[PDB]
Each structure stands twice: as structure tokens, then as C-alpha cells.
Amino acid sequence: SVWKTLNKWLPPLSRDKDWWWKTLGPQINTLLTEADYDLNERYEALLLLYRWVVPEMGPRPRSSVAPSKSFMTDDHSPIEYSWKWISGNKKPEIRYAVELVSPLAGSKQDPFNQIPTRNLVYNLAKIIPELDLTWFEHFWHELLGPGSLTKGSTVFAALEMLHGHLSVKVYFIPVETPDFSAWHQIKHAIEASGCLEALNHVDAYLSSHDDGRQLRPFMLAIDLVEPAASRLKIYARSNQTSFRFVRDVMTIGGLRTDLDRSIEKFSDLWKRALGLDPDTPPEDELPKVDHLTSGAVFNFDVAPKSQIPEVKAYIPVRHYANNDLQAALGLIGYLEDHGHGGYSQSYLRGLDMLAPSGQLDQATGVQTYFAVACQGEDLSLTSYLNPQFYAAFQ
Numbered sequence: 411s412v413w414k415t416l417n418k419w420l421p422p423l424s425r426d427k428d429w430w431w432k433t434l435g436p437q438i439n440t441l442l443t444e445a446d447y448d449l450n451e452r453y454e455a456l457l458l459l460y461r462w463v464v465p466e467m468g469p470r471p472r473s474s475v476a477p478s479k480s481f482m483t484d485d486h487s488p489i490e491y492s493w494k495w496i497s498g499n500k501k502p503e504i505r506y507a508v509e510l511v512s513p514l515a516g517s518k519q520d521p522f523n524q525i526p527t528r529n530l531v532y533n534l535a536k537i538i539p540e541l542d543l544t545w546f547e548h549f550w551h552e553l554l555g556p557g558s559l560t561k562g563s564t565v566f567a568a569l570e571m572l573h574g575h576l577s578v579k580v581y582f583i584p585v586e587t588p589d590f591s592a593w594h595q596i597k598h599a600i601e602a603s604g605c606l607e608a609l610n611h612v613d614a615y616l617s618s619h620d621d622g623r624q625l626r627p628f629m630l631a632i633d634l635v636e637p638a639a640s641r642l643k644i645y646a647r648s649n650q651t652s653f654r655f656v657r658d659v660m661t662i663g664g665l666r667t668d669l670d671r672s673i674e675k676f677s678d679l680w681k682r683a684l685g686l687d688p689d690t691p692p693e694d695e696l697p698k699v700d701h702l703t704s705g706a707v708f709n710f711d712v713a714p715k716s717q718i719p720e721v722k723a724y725i726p727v728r729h730y731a732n733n734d735l736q737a738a739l740g741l742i743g744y745l746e747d748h749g750h751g752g753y754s755q756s757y758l759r760g761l762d763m764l765a766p767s768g769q770l771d772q773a774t775g776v777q778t779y780f781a782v783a784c785q786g787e788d789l790s791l792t793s794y795l796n797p798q799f800y801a802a803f804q
């Protein structure tokens with residue numbers, strides 16, 4: 411085991427950092443091993459984890475009560491893994507998002523817990539040269555800086571191990587005021603970035619469409635590459651849960667055509683993963699669940715390369731499915747029905763590793779979202795996983 415070797419030989423850490431190491435290391439190593447990553451990449455992932463992530467995770471979990479209301483996960487776990495399924499018998503891609511913390515979180519020196527994420531990004535930039543911080547600095551400055559109701563967090567980072575190299579993504583969650591909505595801030599920032607037809611399409615949809623007006627933008631994500639190559643993803647939530655609504659948002663009210671076959675496949679997967687009745691009418695709503703993160707969630711890639719924006723829909727399994735085992739088996743049934751299930755048992759072993767002792771069959775929580783994108787006639791799927799350090803304190 412790569413983690414066992416590194417733990418045998420790296421210098422021992424203090425109580426909190428060591429707990430985080432002996433918890434996150436085995437988890438990330440297990441996921442990468444089930445995704446068949448090369449040994450060297452496993453070593454790199456865990457050495458990054460040991461030097462830059464573990465020291466900045468804060469105090470170790472000690473109760474079912476989290477020391478923050480972090481927006482990363484519903485139980486406020488500050489880590490979220492994700493397992494992207496790749497077509498054509500290829501290996502899955504492993505990514506993990508982290509919200510680092512410091513004893514200054516909440517003080518007037520860092521009231522929204524932003525400095526550790528900044529430092530992490532700068533450290534990575536110093537080590538990996540391919541990272542570009544021009545747009546990070548722009549959007550940080552416009553959304554979190556000295557000018558700038560809270561979702562519990564305002565920034566976090568994501569490491570994508572792309573089999574060969576590492577990419578970084580940054581998420582800004584604007585703080586809203588009665589006069590400046592999150593969407594207001596994100597639109598003004600993007601318009602200042604120096605790109606804009608796709609943004610205008612999203613603005614028209616959100617402002618004047620009957621189903622677009624039910625979306626509330628809340629997050630912006632960028633990649634730390636050259637700004638011409640970076641994606642601009644705007645995340646939007648709605649109280650609506652009918653698949654008729656999800657389909658219309660996927661089509662942006664019809665701006666996107668040539669999506670009929672993939673949306674049929676999407677309806678199949680939606681009912682399969684959520685455990686719905688196969689004859690469920692697309693007009694029907696999911697049974698109501700009141701929660702800060704309930705409802706349908708979507709992202710709109712509004713990057714200048716695109717002309718028309720692209721949409722990714724997130725099936726919220728933690729809120730509308732019956733249990734993680736049912737949801738995972740439904741997703742895997744869809745994937746294997748389309749020849750994309752070479753790593754189904756690897757995914758299940760990862761789930762069992764992440765799952766609270768004996769709860770895959772009884773509860774939701776491990777899988778947070780199944781993200782769906784319509785690539786031509788097929789689907790692109792991503793499973794988002796929550797380690798549940800507090801909902802399931804071991």
C-alpha cells in the first residue's frame with residue numbers, strides 16, 4: 411500500500427494532522443487503486459496530501475457535530491471525492507475538492523475562511539508550472555476581495571488527477587447582500603474578465619424564461635489554466651424537480667437542439683438512479699424535501715469558445731433516492747446497459763470503503779450527486795462522494 415509505505419517513512423504528525431492523514435490517505439489511495447492509477451501517481455497524490463492538505467484541515471472530527479457549516483457537503487465534511495466515468499473501457503478519473511481552514515476562520519482577519527485556499531493554490535502554482543493564476547486573481551478580487559447571507563463557505567479548491575498530470579479548479583461562492591445577488595456579482599465579474607454570447611444566453615434564460623426564472627445562481631467555478639482554455643461554470647439551484655423541468659434546463663429552453671436521444675437516455679438514468687417508477691410522468695415532481703441543497707442543480711459552462719452554453723445536470727441522490735446501494739446499482743445498470751461498466755465493482759468497493767459501517771443499504775449520504783452531461787448522443791456521468799466525517803462519526 412502506497413499510504414502504508416509513506417506512513418511508515420514520513421515524519422509523524424501531531425494528533426489532528428495525523429488523524430486527517432490516516433483517514434484521507436487510505437481513502438484517496440483506495441480510490442486511485444480502484445481506478446487503476448499508476449503507482450507513481452498514487453505516490454504523488456499522497457505526498458501532495460501530506461504536505462499541503464493535511465496540515466490545513468483544522469481539528470480532527472471528534473463528534474457528530476461539525477466545527478463549521480461548510481458548504482462542501484450536507485453534513486459539512488470539508489472533503490468531497492468524485493469518480494468520473496469515461497466511455498470506451500477507459501479508467502475513471504478521480505478528483506477531490508477540499509475546503510482548507512485555519513484558526514482565523516470567522517475572525518475579522520478571515521471572516522469567510524478564504525486564506526488557506528489561496529495559500530494552497532499558490533503552493534500548487536509554485537510546484538506545477540502549467541497552472542495560470544490570472545483569472546483566479548481576477549475572480550478572487552471581484553468576488554471575495556476588499557470590495558465584495560452566506561452559504562457557509564465562499565471558496566474551495568479541487569484537485570483533478572488526470573492520469574498523467576494534475577489540474578486545479580477553484581469554486582467561488584459569493585456572499586449575497588440585499589442589493590447584490592450572487593448572480594449579479596458573477597455576471598459583473600465575468601463581464602470584467604475580458605472574454606460573451608454564451609453568458610448573455612444564460613442571462614436571458616435566467617431572466618425571461620418561465621423555467622429559467624426558477625433557478626438561483628450560487629457558484630462560479632474556473633480552471634487554473636490560461637484564460638482562453640479555462641471553463642466558466644455557473645451553478646444554479648431550483649426548487650423544481652420534475653424531469654420536464656430538468657430536461658428544459660438541459661436544453662436551455664430549446665437553445666440547444668440535437669439532444670433528443672441523449673435526453674431519452676437521461677430520463678432512463680434519472681428514474682433508474684432515483685428509484686422512481688418506470689412509468690413516472692415527466693411532469694410529476696419528486697416528493698418534497700426541504701433542505702439548503704435540495705431541488706435540481708445545474709451548471710452552465712459559459713466559456714467564450716462555446717457560442718452556445720453547455721449544461722450539466724446533477725441528480726441529487728442523497729435527497730431523493732432510497733439508499734446508496736440502490737442508487738449505485740441503478741447507475742451501474744444504466745452504465746452496463748451502454749457498455750460503460752468496466753469499473754462497476756471498483757466503484758462499489760470505493761463506496762464500501764467510504765460508507766459508514768453498515769449503512770449503504772439503509773441510508774443515503776455516501777453519494778451526493780450523479781452529474782450528467784449530454785455529449786452528442788451519449789451521457790457523461792460523474793459520481794460525487796461524501797466521506798461523512800460527522801454524519802457518521804466512527
Ligand SMILES: N[C@@H](Cc1c[nH]c2ccccc12)C(=O)O
Binds near residue numbers: 481707724
Ligand atoms: N455542497 C454544495 C456545493 C457543491 C459541492 N459540490 C457540488 C457539485 C454540484 C453542485 C453543487 C456542489 C451543494 O450541494 O450545492
